[PDB]
Design a protein around this nucleic acid. Structure first.
Ligand SMILES: [Mg+2]
Ligand SMILES: [Mg+2]
Ligand SMILES: [Mg+2]
Ligand SMILES: [Mg+2]
Ligand SMILES: [Mg+2]
Ligand code: NA
Lengths: 48, 148, 220, 178, 119
RNA sequence: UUAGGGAUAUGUGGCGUCAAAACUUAUGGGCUCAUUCUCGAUACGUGAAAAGGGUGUUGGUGCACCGGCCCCGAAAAUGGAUGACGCUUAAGCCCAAUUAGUGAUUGCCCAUUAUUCCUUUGGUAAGGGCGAGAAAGUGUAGCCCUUCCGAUGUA
RNA sequence: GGCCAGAACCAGCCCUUGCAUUAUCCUGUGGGAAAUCCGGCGGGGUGCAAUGGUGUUGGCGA
RNA sequence: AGAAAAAUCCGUAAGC
RNA sequence: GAUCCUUCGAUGUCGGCUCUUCCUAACCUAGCGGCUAAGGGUUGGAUUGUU
RNA sequence: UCGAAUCGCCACCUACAAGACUGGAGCUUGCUCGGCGCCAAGUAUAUUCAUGAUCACAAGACA
């Protein structure tokens, strides 16, 4: 394998014409850790 | 590959044939006979007014053609069995006891065999009476094989 | 069975009862190998799956051919110590699980997790009966996969003839379950008819342009 | 699908020389994938029959022949193939198509399936459309009856590619996964 | 079941001419037929595979015979044509139209609830 | 056929799961059912002969022969091998396509290969100069700048 | 903080009908009702071209 | 976080 | 027999005794009309280092 | 302790069987006659939303 590129399967997208619509979009992958580290709005909005 | 292959039969008055899901039920004076044909994949059709029974095969090789004739023969045997019935005869010291539904044979040259309910056996030289040919032939062959 | 610590944590937190997303597949009249391949790929993609009615899967050919195949499989055992050798499971659910396991990468933690994400039953058990509608796999069904003239075999009969003492038990349980469900569905017919009639009657009372839009889009 | 062969006409000659100042011109019909293969078959036939090699020859024209209007006809294809331990074999078969090219493509697929014969071992002698009363085989004769009709059974009808699903509800059209 | 015969009306399943109606004008072979329809501009005479058609319940017995039979009107009236037109409408739709359909369905559901409670 | 790295596209081989690719494509044609080593199924290479039969065809004519697939001929020593599972409206065999009789052009997957971009190093090297910067110079922390080509390797 | 992100613009690079041939062809006017098919007469779909920059808006950092 | 469990009392996915 | 691929800073050599397992082209036992069948059996002594 | 990833729900799905099979007839044997849910408890007359300042785990939940 070459780890610098990943393969993603999206629900209800089942054709190459469909997958062409999504080129350029942004993807996230949320997870969690063990301790609380810094975030984007750490100082303003301490509820994050 | 012939497109359509056909075989037809006529039905006597007083006897009815009903087909549904490759299930055949022939009703006559004597009683009702049921046959199973789900392993065939054929097209069975009945027209009461014309009193005709037909079986079709669409886009068939030699094997389906060969099966059509056997289907017609089986239906014919069923209608004959429900119309008049069958009566086989067997005759062979050996002492054979008809009893009721149990056949006992002793002093040959004790063997016991159970006679199915649908067949009624009596001794005149025994007499086998059934509504279908397969059961009567099977009983006669069983008795012959036992007495051998 | 949950531990007393787990129960105490649940009670202290106070959260409500939780069930994860599970797909239940009714495997009656499916082709064994095609169903196994599809299910294995979905397990690797990360789904939780429960399969029921594993005793009515199908294989192609005659029962005698498939039984001889199984006996050939059963003939393999480690001669020096058979308690280490291959273990030959006779139940249909174990047969299905072994087929899927052979289609997975079983000696890796990822493949082990995938295989543990699967549950298999015979018939439909009470803890599965009332969880929602069952699904099918249309690309692995017999009536579209096999030509009708050829013979086939049902997994339950072959497994009964190689072992598997619980065929009659499963048959009785299935008959009772279907009877209970038939009684329940014979009930509620009045309620279903009442809802259908109310749906038909509401058209006369809703606004006319809304009715027009419904008719245009085919929901009329 | 459309047929995988084309109908070509190659016209050729030997290059004029002092011994042969006015050579003969020949016309050749061949069913080929493209015109390079058409020319190759032309020169093979010319060498094998008239003792003329491609290196001292001229190709005057190659063109592709147009076909007739779409009508269901019966075609007679006269064909010959080679296989070892059998020698050359010549056979005549009747097909049922909408054009000469279609009939010949059918013949090629049939020969490949039934005798393991390949394109460079097959040769086509004649193809023509015959009237419906000259058919000598029932399997082809049954298609021009006046009351021909049949139903469609064992239909394995699938879904549009955009609507295919992996899991669907048991007695419903609702897709669960995909 | 509906038979395949000359003059039978069929619907196309897949391909560039899908969900269109034509008439069978010649049976080439067990697998192929010729289809034409004077009314539709895209349905000139062509070859279709029998895996790509669905027979209907109308069989004319060309333009004059079709017009006399009036099978096109009956097909327009039946429920399959309605479903096909509704599918095309749903395919070509905007956000505003989807909103309108949503409010219409919600209105119907509310009035069904009220009627059920009343009864 | 090989300097250290990206992107694009290919070769051999493939596209049911293992395992990237037809989420099991086609709006292509035929053939085949194989009951205990045995239906088939990637050459090199690792499964077989005379003779005999079933299902689809071909010369001849007023029955004989003669090919495709399958079966018999076909018997060993630890339990075992189309790689495994499995597959039969094939996921097998012989042909043929690229989204399908609708109308110009390449279905898609994978290299230390090809094209292109960045950096190093060496030349039978080729040009220019002499607000922080420049040494008339084989070899440095290379006098400075641009350009082109090669780069694996046992004794 | 050129520390991390978003959008915009330049340059470059990757992608995204015409005229020839149109004829074993098209179209009217003995054989097998009609059609498929065979002689007479009259009228007419495939080979080329068309990474580098230059600011701006937030987050974290007192 | 997935039970071959369950869905005044007792007995009836009913009348109960 | 042929060969010379591995092993010459070493892989202990005939027969018997003891003990377990596997094969079939079936001696006995078991079914058929020569075929099927590897499940259970297949001895003890004189001479000879013997096989 | 504990903050965490997951983002449709239902006494209308959660019963069953067959694809040479699909509502009922006729003979002429192939012709004729899931439900809801997506911002007014419901399609109208209304009503609070900022300064959380232009993306950032949805700063919000377990309908
Ligand atoms: Mg090499
Ligand atoms: Mg894959
Ligand atoms: Mg070197
Ligand atoms: Mg060295
Ligand atoms: Mg020697
Ligand atoms: Na392989």
């Amino acid at each position: 394998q070459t780890k610098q590129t990943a393969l993603v399967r999206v629900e209800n997208v089942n054709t190459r014409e469909d997958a062409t619509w999504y080129v350029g979009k942004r993807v996230c992958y949320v997870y969690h850790g063990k301790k609380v580290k810094r975030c984007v709005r750490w100082s303003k909005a301490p509820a994050r | 590959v012939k497109v359509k292959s056909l075989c037809t039969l006529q039905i006597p008055e007083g006897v009815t044939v009903d087909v549904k899901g490759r299930k055949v039920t022939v009703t006559g004076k004597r009683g009702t006979l049921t046959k199973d044909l789900t392993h065939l994949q054929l097209d069975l059709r009945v027209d009461k007014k014309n009193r005709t029974f037909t079986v079709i095969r669409w886009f068939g090789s030699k094997i389906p053609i060969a099966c059509l004739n056997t289907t017609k023969a089986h239906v014919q045997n069923m209608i004959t069995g429900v119309t008049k019935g069958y009566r086989f005869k067997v005759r062979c010291p050996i002492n054979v006891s008809v009893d009721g539904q149990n056949i006992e044979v002793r002093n040959f040259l004790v063997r016991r065999q159970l006679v199915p309910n649908t067949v009624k056996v009596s001794q005149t030289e025994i007499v086998f009476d059934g509504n279908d040919l397969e059961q009567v032939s099977r009983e006669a062959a069983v008795l012959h094989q036992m007495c051998l | 069975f949950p531990s007393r610590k787990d129960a105490f944590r649940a009670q202290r937190k106070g959260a409500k009862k939780h069930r994860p997303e599970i797909i239940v597949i009714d495997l009656k009249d499916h082709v064994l190998g095609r169903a196994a391949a599809v299910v294995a790929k979905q397990l690797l993609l990360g789904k939780k799956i429960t399969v029921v009615r594993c005793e009515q899967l199908n294989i192609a050919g005659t029962e005698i051919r498939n039984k001889i195949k199984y006996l050939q499989y059963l003939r393999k055992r480690k001669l020096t110590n058979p308690t280490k050798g291959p273990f030959h499971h006779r139940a249909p659910s174990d047969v299905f699980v072994r087929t899927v396991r052979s289609m997975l990468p079983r000696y890796t933690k990822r493949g082990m997790k995938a295989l543990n994400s699967l549950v298999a039953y015979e018939g439909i058990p009470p803890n599965v009966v009332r969880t929602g509608g069952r699904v099918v796999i249309p690309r692995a069904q017999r009536h579209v996969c096999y030509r009708s003239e050829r013979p086939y075999t049902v997994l339950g009969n072959m497994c009964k003839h190689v072992g598997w003492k619980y065929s009659d038990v499963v048959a009785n349980l299935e008959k009772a379950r279907v009877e209970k469900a038939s009684r329940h569905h014979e009930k509620q017919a009045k309620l279903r008819d009442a809802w259908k009639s109310a749906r038909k009657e509401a058209l006369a009372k809703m606004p006319k342009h809304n009715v027009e839009v419904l008719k245009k889009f085919g929901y009329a | 699908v459309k047929p995988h062969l084309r109908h070509y006409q190659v016209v050729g000659r030997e290059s004029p020389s002092e011994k042969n100042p006015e050579p003969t011109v020949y016309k050749f019909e061949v069913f080929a994938p493209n015109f390079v293969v058409a020319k190759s078959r032309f020169w093979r036939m010319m060498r094998v029959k008239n003792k003329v090699k491609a290196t001292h020859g001229d190709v005057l024209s190659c063109k592709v022949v147009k076909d007739a209007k779409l009508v269901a006809r019966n075609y007679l294809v006269d064909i010959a193939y080679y296989s070892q331990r059998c020698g050359y074999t010549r056979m005549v078969k009747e097909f049922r198509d909408v054009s000469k090219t279609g009939a010949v493509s059918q013949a090629y697929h049939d020969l490949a399936s039934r005798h393991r014969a390949r394109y460079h071992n097959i040769e086509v002698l004649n193809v023509k459309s015959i009237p419906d009363h000259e058919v000598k085989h029932l399997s082809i004769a049954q298609y021009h009856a006046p009351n021909l009709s049949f139903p469609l059974l064992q239909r394995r009808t699938k879904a549009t590619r955009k609507d295919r699903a992996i899991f669907v509800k048991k007695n419903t059209k609702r897709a669960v996964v995909a | 079941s509906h038979y395949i015969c000359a003059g039978r009306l069929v619907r196309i399943l897949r391909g560039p001419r899908q969900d269109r109606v034509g008439v069978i004008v010649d049976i080439v072979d067990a697998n192929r037929v010729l289809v034409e329809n004077p009314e539709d501009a895209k349905m000139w005479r062509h070859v279709q595979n029998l895996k790509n058609v669905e027979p209907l319940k109308y069989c004319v017995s060309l333009k004059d015979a079709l017009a006399s039979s009036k099978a096109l009107e009956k097909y327009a009236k039946t429920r399959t044509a309605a479903r096909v037109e509704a599918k095309k409408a749903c395919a070509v739709s905007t956000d505003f139209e989807r909103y309108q359909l949503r409010v219409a369905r919600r209105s119907r559901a509310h009035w069904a609830r009220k009627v059920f409670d009343e009864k």
